[PDB]
Amino acid sequence: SRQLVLVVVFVALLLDNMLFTVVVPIVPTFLYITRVGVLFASKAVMQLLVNPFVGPLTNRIGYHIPMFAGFVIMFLSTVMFAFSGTYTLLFVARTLQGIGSSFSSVAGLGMLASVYTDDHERGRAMGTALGGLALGLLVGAPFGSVMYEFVGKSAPFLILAFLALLDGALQLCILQPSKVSPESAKGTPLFMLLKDPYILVAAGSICFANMGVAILEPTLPIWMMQTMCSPKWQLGLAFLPASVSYLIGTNLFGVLANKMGRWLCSLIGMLVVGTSLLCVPLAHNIFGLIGPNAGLGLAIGMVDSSMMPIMGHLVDLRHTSVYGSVYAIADVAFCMGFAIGPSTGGAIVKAIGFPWLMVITGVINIVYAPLCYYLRSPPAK
Amino acid sequence: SRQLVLVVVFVALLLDNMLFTVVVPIVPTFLYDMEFFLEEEITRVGVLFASKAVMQLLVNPFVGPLTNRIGYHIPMFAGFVIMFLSTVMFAFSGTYTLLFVARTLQGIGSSFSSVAGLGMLASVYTDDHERGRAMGTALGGLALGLLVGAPFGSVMYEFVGKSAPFLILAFLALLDGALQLCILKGTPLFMLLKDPYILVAAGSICFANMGVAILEPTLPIWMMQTMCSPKWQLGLAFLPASVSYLIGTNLFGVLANKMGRWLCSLIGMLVVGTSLLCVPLAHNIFGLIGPNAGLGLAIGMVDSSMMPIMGHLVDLRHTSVYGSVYAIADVAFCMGFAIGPSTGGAIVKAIGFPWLMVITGVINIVYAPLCYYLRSPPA
Ligand SMILES: COC(=O)[C@H]1[C@H]2C[C@@H]3c4[nH]c5cc(OC)ccc5c4CCN3C[C@H]2C[C@@H](OC(=O)c2cc(OC)c(OC)c(OC)c2)[C@@H]1OC
Numbered sequence: 047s048r049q050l051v052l053v054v055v056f057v058a059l060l061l062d063n064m065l066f067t068v069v070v071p072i073v074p075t076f077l078y079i080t081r082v083g084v085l086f087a088s089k090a091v092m093q094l095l096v097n098p099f100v101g102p103l104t105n106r107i108g109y110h111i112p113m114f115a116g117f118v119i120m121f122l123s124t125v126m127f128a129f130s131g132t133y134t135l136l137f138v139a140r141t142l143q144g145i146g147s148s149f150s151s152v153a154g155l156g157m158l159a160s161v162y163t164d165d166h167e168r169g170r171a172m173g174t175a176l177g178g179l180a181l182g183l184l185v186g187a188p189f190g191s192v193m194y195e196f197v198g199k200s201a202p203f204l205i206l207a208f209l210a211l212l213d214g215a216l217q218l219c220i221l222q223p224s225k226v227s228p229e230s231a232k233g234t235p236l237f238m239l240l241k242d243p244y245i246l247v248a249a250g251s252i253c254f255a256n257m258g259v260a261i262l263e264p265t266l267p268i269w270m271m272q273t274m275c276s277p278k279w280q281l282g283l284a285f286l287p288a289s290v291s292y293l294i295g296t297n298l299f300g301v302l303a304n305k306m307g308r309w310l311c312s313l314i315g316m317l318v319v320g321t322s323l324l325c326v327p328l329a330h331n332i333f334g335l336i337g338p339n340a341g342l343g344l345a346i347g348m349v350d351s352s353m354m355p356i357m358g359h360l361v362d363l364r365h366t367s368v369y370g371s372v373y374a375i376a377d378v379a380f381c382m383g384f385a386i387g388p389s390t391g392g393a394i395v396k397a398i399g400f401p402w403l404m405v406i407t408g409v410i411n412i413v414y415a416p417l418c419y420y421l422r423s424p425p426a427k
Numbered sequence: 428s429r430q431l432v433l434v435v436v437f438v439a440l441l442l443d444n445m446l447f448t449v450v451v452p453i454v455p456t457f458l459y460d461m462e463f464f465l466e467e468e469i470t471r472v473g474v475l476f477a478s479k480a481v482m483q484l485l486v487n488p489f490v491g492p493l494t495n496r497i498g499y500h501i502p503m504f505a506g507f508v509i510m511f512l513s514t515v516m517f518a519f520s521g522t523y524t525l526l527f528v529a530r531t532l533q534g535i536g537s538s539f540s541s542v543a544g545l546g547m548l549a550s551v552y553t554d555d556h557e558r559g560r561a562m563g564t565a566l567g568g569l570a571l572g573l574l575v576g577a578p579f580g581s582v583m584y585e586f587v588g589k590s591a592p593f594l595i596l597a598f599l600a601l602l603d604g605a606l607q608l609c610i611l612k613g614t615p616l617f618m619l620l621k622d623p624y625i626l627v628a629a630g631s632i633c634f635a636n637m638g639v640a641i642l643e644p645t646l647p648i649w650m651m652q653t654m655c656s657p658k659w660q661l662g663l664a665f666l667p668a669s670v671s672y673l674i675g676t677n678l679f680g681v682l683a684n685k686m687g688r689w690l691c692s693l694i695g696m697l698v699v700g701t702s703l704l705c706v707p708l709a710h711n712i713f714g715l716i717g718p719n720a721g722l723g724l725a726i727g728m729v730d731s732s733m734m735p736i737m738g739h740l741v742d743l744r745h746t747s748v749y750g751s752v753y754a755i756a757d758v759a760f761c762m763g764f765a766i767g768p769s770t771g772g773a774i775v776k777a778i779g780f781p782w783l784m785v786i787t788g789v790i791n792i793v794y795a796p797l798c799y800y801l802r803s804p805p806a
């Protein structure tokens with residue numbers, strides 16, 4: 047039944063981020079710049095304030111009930127999006143989407159770590175989970191775009207709700223969301239784990255790579271309109287190479303980094319993240335961003351697939367075998383990088399500028415890259 | 428004949444590089460043989476290896492006016508003589524002090540020979556494209572000397588005794604003198620290190636070359652301490668470095684201009700740092716074929732991407748001469764070979780060699796973002 051758990055996480059993370067990326071191409075057309083920016087950040091902020099309360103929560107109720115709650119909140123958010131047509135209602139739906147995604151991500155990654163106890167196999171299970179995440183990000187944009195250009199606004203949200211119902215049936219079949227079972231092992235407190243430089247280094251690498259992508263997310267279209275003066279239909283396709291490379295890289299490197307070397311995988315991934323971010327503000331046309339964006343996506347996939355099991359290896363080597371808090375910290379890094387991007391990108395660009403922002407991010411990644419060597423062989427307990 | 432000057436300069440540079448890289452795997456073994464504990468003498472070994480760089484740095488400014496005053500053949504002949512004494516002293520020295528004098532003489536003679544021979548080659552070939560054919564051939568001979576000398580002394584220290592390779596090199600030096608025996612300005616360097624762009628390029632070259640500069644005095648001792656390899660493999664381990672450097676320099680001289688020189692230099696510095704980090708984890712001679720080959724390829728990348736950048740920087744702003752790119756990278760070379768081995772003894776005494784490799788790799792990686800300064804430099 048171990049494989050069956052991965053199937054849910056493949057589909058749980060598939061649909062959780064499908065609404066996260068299907069709402070972007072329907073909101074600015076529907077409501078028709080700062081006001082729209084704060085809307086997207088609602089998922090990031092609200093999940094950040096709930097992650098510390100979710101980590102220890104999984105130590106007493108298990109990963110099943112939080113996942114079922116995330117499913118329920120997914121259903122409610124998508125159905126509310128299907129009907130609500132005001133700024134406040136969309137903000138509430140976004141906040142619900144963020145909180146439910148918090149449960150879904152944390153519980154899914156924790157249960158994936160728990161049910162897989164071999165580092166080599168767990169480096170491929172998480173790789174395929176991140177591949178499903180990349181597939182969801184790939185399919186979110188064209189889905190909503192096409193069925194808003196044709197079927198109607200409530201159509202894609204209704205279809206996603208039906209797929210969520212299928213997900214609930216699947217979780218009733220295999221995940222068993224019926225009873226609360228506390229974890230036998232007592233996880234270490236979060237503020238012990240924040241004092242461990244190894245977990246700090248891993249979380250920092252993840253947070254800095256995802257900050258490199260997150261800052262690029264909203265800031266890139268503004269730079270495109272300012273410099274290249276390009277139509278709208280290909281702006282979403284601009285990030286398509288990055289997401290495709292992320293999917294390919296997460297699968298391949300979940301296969302490969304176990305034999306390549308985890309520390310080396312993270313180091314080279316951060317180095318290519320830095321180099322790609324340096325080269326990104328140098329492109330003079332849409333074709334010029336295929337290379338740097340593809341490299342950045344592959345690098346972020348490398349960092350994710352190499353540090354996602356590295357957290358489990360660290361917690362198994364030093365701390366106890368309770369997995370909620372470490373992935374709570376990792377998702378906190380993810381979500382903080384997500385939050386810092388859109389709410390502050392305009393101010394950062396107006397103050398220093400996009401090229402200097404990318405240079406700063408890339409230099410931080412490069413200078414931080416050697417610190418990943420600290421995880422080559424962390425001492426045991 | 429003009430080709431005679433080419434062959435004599437080729438032999439001179441080849442012999443200089445051969446001596447430099449043949450003193451590498453013999454001095455640690457030679458010192459160990461006398462006693463039969465190298466952590467106490469590592470500092471003196473580093474100072475000995477840096478003596479040539481220090482002495483060359485001291486004597487470099489005088490050679491210019493010295494060459495102007497008396498000519499080229501006499502200082503070039505002086506290099507032959509001092510190299511002969513260096514080879515003979517290496518063949519017969521038994522104490523540390525004698526070897527130090529031999530290395531200092533080798534440095535003085537190397538400076539004399541290199542400067543005088545390159546000046547004579549420039550004087551004879553006034554085609555202005557010839558140097559590109561003749562200078563390229565001379566540098567290829569330098570690369571061949573680096574390729575051959577390191578395993579040479581490694582190969583023939585357990586087979587033909589101790590002074591055999593040095594005697595052969597002295598005999599070749601006699602042939603080099605015989606070949607030459609039947610024969611017949613702008614922007615001084617002190618103002619070329621006041622520009623931050625050229626300083627960035629020179630620092631890149633020096634920090635990339637420091638990976639091998641530190642390796643030369645301490646790697647054979649590390650091998651004899653941890654792996655217990657045979658005495659004819661210590662100089663063999665540097666064979667992958669030479670092969671990788673030749674492959675990388677050719678390939679990237681072909682291929683670097685299309686992807687951008689700054690990107691090639693940045694990637695090369697990053698891979699230099701990664702390879703120097705990977706070096707301490709090698710657990711046998713076979714394990715070092717990967718990291719050492721990668722480090723050699725990385726240094727070749729850095730050189731092939733920096734030398735054209737140095738040429739462009741010198742041409743756009745200052746008035747460049749045939750040796751401006753040679754001089755600036757040379758000063759980086761001597762500075763690296765003097766500051767690496769000199770502080771290497773102290774660093775390995777305080778902390779292990781792996782920490783030294785980690786430190787050098789970290790400096791290279793952190794300096795790597797500084798290569799953005801050279802992306803389209805403006806007057
Ligand atoms: C030692 O003797 C040197 O110092 C030469 C080499 C130094 C260093 C090195 N030592 C080793 C020792 C080993 O065993 C212990 C094994 C491997 C290595 C390697 C591999 C890496 N490496 C580089 C070697 C290359 C030489 O430099 C040039 O070839 C050159 C080329 C140019 O144009 C193309 C120039 O510009 C016209 C120029 O002038 C500035 C110089 C350099 O200086 C003459």
Ligand SMILES: NC[C@H](O)c1ccc(O)c(O)c1
Nearest residue numbers: 183256259285288289292346
């Ligand atoms: N884990 C998500 C990752 O940061 C990412 C990669 C590529 C993207 O186009 C994206 O929106 C997010």
